Design a protein around this motif. Structure first.
Motif, mmCIF file in Angstrom:
data_model
loop_
_atom_site.group_PDB
_atom_site.id
_atom_site.type_symbol
_atom_site.label_atom_id
_atom_site.label_comp_id
_atom_site.label_asym_id
_atom_site.label_seq_id
_atom_site.Cartn_x
_atom_site.Cartn_y
_atom_site.Cartn_z
ATOM 1 N N UNK A 1 -19.822 2.020 -16.848
ATOM 2 C CA UNK A 1 -20.447 0.962 -16.069
ATOM 3 C C UNK A 1 -19.903 1.047 -14.650
ATOM 4 N N UNK B 1 -24.195 -4.306 -2.206
ATOM 5 C CA UNK B 1 -22.843 -4.523 -2.699
ATOM 6 C C UNK B 1 -22.895 -5.392 -3.948
ATOM 7 N N UNK B 2 -22.034 -5.070 -4.916
ATOM 8 C CA UNK B 2 -21.951 -5.732 -6.218
ATOM 9 C C UNK B 2 -23.199 -5.517 -7.068
ATOM 10 N N UNK B 3 -23.862 -4.379 -6.901
ATOM 11 C CA UNK B 3 -24.885 -3.914 -7.822
ATOM 12 C C UNK B 3 -24.235 -3.093 -8.926
ATOM 13 N N UNK B 4 -24.784 -3.181 -10.135
ATOM 14 C CA UNK B 4 -24.184 -2.557 -11.308
ATOM 15 C C UNK B 4 -25.230 -1.805 -12.118
ATOM 16 N N UNK C 1 -24.740 -8.914 -9.341
ATOM 17 C CA UNK C 1 -23.655 -9.789 -9.752
ATOM 18 C C UNK C 1 -23.079 -10.535 -8.558
ATOM 19 N N UNK D 1 -19.590 -12.135 -6.490
ATOM 20 C CA UNK D 1 -18.257 -11.615 -6.220
ATOM 21 C C UNK D 1 -17.277 -12.090 -7.274
ATOM 22 N N UNK D 2 -16.190 -11.355 -7.485
ATOM 23 C CA UNK D 2 -15.229 -11.753 -8.521
ATOM 24 C C UNK D 2 -14.461 -12.998 -8.112
ATOM 25 N N UNK E 1 -10.233 -9.814 -5.143
ATOM 26 C CA UNK E 1 -9.898 -8.430 -5.400
ATOM 27 C C UNK E 1 -8.441 -8.185 -5.017
ATOM 28 N N UNK F 1 -11.883 -2.404 -16.743
ATOM 29 C CA UNK F 1 -13.037 -2.867 -15.993
ATOM 30 C C UNK F 1 -13.644 -4.112 -16.619
ATOM 31 N N UNK G 1 -12.348 -7.229 -14.944
ATOM 32 C CA UNK G 1 -12.956 -7.292 -13.624
ATOM 33 C C UNK G 1 -14.370 -7.841 -13.699
ATOM 34 N N UNK G 2 -15.152 -7.377 -14.670
ATOM 35 C CA UNK G 2 -16.541 -7.800 -14.781
ATOM 36 C C UNK G 2 -16.683 -9.196 -15.362
ATOM 37 N N UNK H 1 -17.189 -11.643 -12.719
ATOM 38 C CA UNK H 1 -18.348 -11.394 -11.874
ATOM 39 C C UNK H 1 -19.660 -11.733 -12.551
#
Ligand SMILES: [K+]
Ligand SMILES: [Mg+2]
Ligand SMILES: [Mg+2]
Ligand SMILES: [Mg+2]
Ligand SMILES: [Mg+2]
Ligand SMILES: [Mg+2]
Ligand SMILES: [Mg+2]
Ligand SMILES: [Mg+2]
Ligand SMILES: [Mg+2]
Ligand SMILES: [Mg+2]
Ligand code: NA
Ligand code: NA
Ligand code: NA
Lengths: 66, 178, 151, 63, 63
Positions: free
Chosen positions: D32, D58-61, E28, E30-31, E35, E55, E58-59, E62
């Motif tokens: 991922x 940014x922050x696309x997955x 998504x 931002x976390x 960061x 990960x 982290x996800x 988000x």
RNA sequence: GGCCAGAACCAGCCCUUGCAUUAUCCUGUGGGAAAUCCGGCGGGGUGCAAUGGUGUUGGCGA
RNA sequence: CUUUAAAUGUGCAAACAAACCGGCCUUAGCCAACUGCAAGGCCGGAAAGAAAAGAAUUAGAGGCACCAAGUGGGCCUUCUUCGGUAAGCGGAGCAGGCGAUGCGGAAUGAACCGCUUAGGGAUAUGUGGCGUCAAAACUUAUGGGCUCAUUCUCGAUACGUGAAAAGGGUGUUGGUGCACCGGCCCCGAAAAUGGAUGACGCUUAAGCCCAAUUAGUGAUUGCCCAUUAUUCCUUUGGUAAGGGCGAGAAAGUGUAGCCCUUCCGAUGUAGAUGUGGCCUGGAGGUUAGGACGAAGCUUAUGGCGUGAGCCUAAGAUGGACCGGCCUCUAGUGCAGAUCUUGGUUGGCGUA
């Protein structure tokens, strides 16, 4: 008063892309090739055209008759 | 606070091939913040010594080692760091903690403070606990005397966070503001 | 400084070490037809019918054959598009190309598989990937560590 | 199926550990990927790779 | 169903490409919590690079 | 006056232990009183999951 | 100069106008000949339509034309460099920027760091921070070390703007039976208006090197700030996508949009194009107004429109002409040209 640079040229070239080459089966001319083979090829093509006309005539007659 | 490092054990191998159908298996001990850094240090050591890159290798297991019961012991830490114009330097120091991880974290903070050395430039060779009669420094030897005692002076004792005040009465515990 | 035909070819047009000499007899006996794929590599020892230095590593298709010469079509990018250049060289400066070898092998293998299936023989068992896991029994186990003697 | 696979892996690892061997796990098959930097001062090659991977913001997955 | 899609993605089935190509890229937030450093590798104390199965945490901040 | 306020209810949205590994480990039975420490023998804490509405009560407005 | 020789590069190929496997026709093209080779066709067959071995991916519609603008002084940075003593100097290679561009940070800066721009809320972040100025640890920690600096001078946000050989104090490190060798601080260290970690100040730091998140109690994110991310409402445009034909519906490019739902984009100098887009003088038509007051002029006169603008009100103004719509037409829109003509004005009740 005389300056030279290649700075923006790649970007300008890739704006509308580098177009790829034409497929090899198009613009397949034979002018300037070896004349002895060119002449024989022309004779064979003439015979082929006559044969195609005859074949179409035969097809038409067959369809009409049956 | 609890120590900021962990004790890991990484076991690894090179991927078997036709020239190498039965490769050797190695065991590695490292003190790291997490297991990704543990694996990175493992593969760095394997490449630097055995000529094996991570891209043709296998990691068989990584696990975190548990520690002993809480007892005050003296620890010997054998360490080596790098700095330019000095080359590689190897030093041996004795610490006084309750676990191997604590001793090694103490060593890292000490090296950072006294020599400006950082984690990726330090390497740990050995850590062990030594008996109280093998200590060769007085600053550590003075803590296992039979009649050790001292008072607490220059104590800057503060208040509970919920009771702190900005202004208080001069000879009283009464808060005027807050 | 000068836009000559052979400027800056001192290393490009030069024989390899202990490999000097005029072409061999296999080169003379090699057969080229129209539609083949060839490599254009200059031979410094011939000096007749050499290509320009641009075409020294390119691959193209044959469009013309003469008594001692070949005609090759080669792509060349000029600004925003690609041209199809036609160059005439002697037969010593071209060499048959193995750029379609894998494709032809694939086609032959598929035909062999089809023949075996039609005949009724048993096909070989399919290969197994190396990305799977399993129990590892190690003959030798060692300890990896930095020692004092290393520095 | 998920429960059965997990149990099977557990038994295999225990069987190796009892005899003193090791168990090698199957390599991961899926990843991922998320983009953590914005769109500014990117080389043409990396720009094209990110466009092919479908990470243009940014922050696309993606998987 | 949606469980079919989850199974294909998770196990890298025979329709992995179909299922993932038929989706829009995930967008998504931002976390939450922040960061570490977007200019360093995860091994150096930053954020970019491969961080294995870490990960997921982290996800989880988000999604 | 839907002019200004308060409370209530629907919908949506934001938030707010389990099983794996548990051993360089735990526990009885030459050295430095005891402990720290080193050989013999016996018994055994960290990676995954669990704005929109529908009325009601006051104030101001004769 | 030279065999040896990288890393980064660079050409070609990877089954639908292609290629494969066996009849037949034509040609002299080659060969001593042909049913051999070459070339162009007709006929019939096969086809995981490209398997398995890590065995691609795509916000992945290919090709072809016509007409025309601006530009042709560049500059900075990362790496590579030639000339030059050097240079905010001259000349090049690759890429990214500024020019043409704001916004959030580095106290300040075209180009550094983050982010790239329709009109607005809420939530969360990036760079940078949390003693006051100034939002955030009302000066956090139940973390470890080090340091005292007497007149430009202890330190303290890169790019970038404070320094070398040599010599000493306090904390440590190899060696051994004294020598060396690093951390911090001091000396080496000399200018012209009064002055600059941004200022104040700070030393049980508010300094330097490491490390945490409420603390050896036991799963998860201390908190502060964007024109960024997620989400909600509204506008506008599509290479747009669907549905319909008690107040309501027009078979529809463009309106006060025929009606409803849905998705995506929105900055921009020189430049191009569109608009049932706004405005001025006159002509052909059509529909209207005026002595119960036309044009013109005045405004704390509101209403409408993103805007150019339109419309109403009041005149304790005026006294005879003129509005809307559809076409046609041109001497058709002003802030600056040492612009042209007329009036006014500070200097000034001054010289
Ligand atoms: K020029
Ligand atoms: Mg940050
Ligand atoms: Mg200009
Ligand atoms: Mg910018
Ligand atoms: Mg404040
Ligand atoms: Mg625009
Ligand atoms: Mg313009
Ligand atoms: Mg006129
Ligand atoms: Mg006024
Ligand atoms: Mg005019
Ligand atoms: Na120009
Ligand atoms: Na400051
Ligand atoms: Na005027």
């Amino acid at each position: 008063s005389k300056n030279h640079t290649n700075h923006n040229q790649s970007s300008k070239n890739h704006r509308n892309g580098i177009k790829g080459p034409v497929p090899l089966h198009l613009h397949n001319s034979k002018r300037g090739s070896w004349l002895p083979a060119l002449v024989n090829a022309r004779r064979v093509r003439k015979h082929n055209q006559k044969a195609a006309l005859k074949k179409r005539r035969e097809r038409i007659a067959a369809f009409a008759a049956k | 606070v609890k120590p900021h490092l962990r004790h890991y054990q990484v076991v690894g191998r090179e991927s078997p091939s036709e020239k190498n159908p039965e490769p050797t298996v190695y065991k590695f001990e490292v003190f790291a913040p997490n297991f990704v850094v543990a694996k990175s240090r493992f593969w760095r050591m394997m490449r630097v010594k055995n000529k094996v890159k991570a891209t043709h290798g296998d990691v068989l297991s990584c696990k975190v080692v548990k520690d002993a019961k809480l007892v005050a012991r003296n620890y010997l830490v054998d360490i080596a760091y790098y700095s330019q114009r000095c080359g590689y330097t190897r030093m041996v120091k004795e610490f006084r903690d309750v676990s191997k991880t604590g001793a090694v974290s103490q060593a890292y903070h000490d090296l950072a403070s006294r020599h400006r050395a950082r984690y990726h430039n330090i390497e740990v060779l050995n850590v062990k606990s030594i008996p109280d009669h093998e200590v060769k420094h007085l600053s550590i030897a003075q803590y296992h005397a039979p009649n050790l005692s001292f008072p607490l002076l220059q104590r800057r004792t503060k208040a509970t966070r919920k009771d702190r005040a900005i202004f208080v009465k001069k000879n009283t515990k009464r808060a005027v503001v807050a | 400084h000068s836009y000559g035909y052979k400027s800056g070819t001192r290393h490009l047009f030069a024989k390899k070490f202990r490999k000097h000499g005029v072409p061999s007899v296999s080169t003379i006996l090699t057969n080229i037809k129209v539609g083949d794929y060839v490599d254009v590599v200059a031979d410094s020892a011939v000096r007749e019918g050499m290509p320009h230095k641009y075409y020294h590593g390119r691959t193209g298709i044959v469009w013309n054959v003469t008594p001692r010469g070949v005609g090759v079509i080669i792509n060349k990018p000029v600004r925003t598009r690609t041209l199809r250049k036609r160059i005439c060289v002697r037969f010593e400066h071209v060499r048959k190309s193995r750029c379609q070898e894998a494709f032809k092998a694939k086609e032959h293998q598929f035909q062999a598989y089809l023949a075996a299936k039609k005949a009724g023989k048993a096909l070989p068992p399919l290969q197994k990937s190396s990305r799977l896991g399993g129990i590892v029994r190690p003959k030798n186990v060692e300890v990896l560590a930095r020692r004092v003697a290393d520095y | 199926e998920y429960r059965g696979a997990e149990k099977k892996l557990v038994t295999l690892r225990r069987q190796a550990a009892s005899h003193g061997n090791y168990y090698l796990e199957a390599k991961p098959k899926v990843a991922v990927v998320t983009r953590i930097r914005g769109i500014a001062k990117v080389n043409p090659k990396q720009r094209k790779i990110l466009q092919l991977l479908r990470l243009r913001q940014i922050f696309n997955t993606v998987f | 169903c949606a469980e079919d899609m989850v199974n294909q993605i998770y196990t890298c089935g025979k329709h992995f490409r179909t299922v993932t190509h038929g989706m829009w890229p995930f967008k998504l937030a931002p976390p939450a919590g922040g960061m570490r450093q977007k200019r360093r590798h995860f091994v150096e104390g930053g954020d970019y690079g491969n961080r294995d199965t870490l990960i997921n945490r982290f996800l989880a901040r988000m999604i």
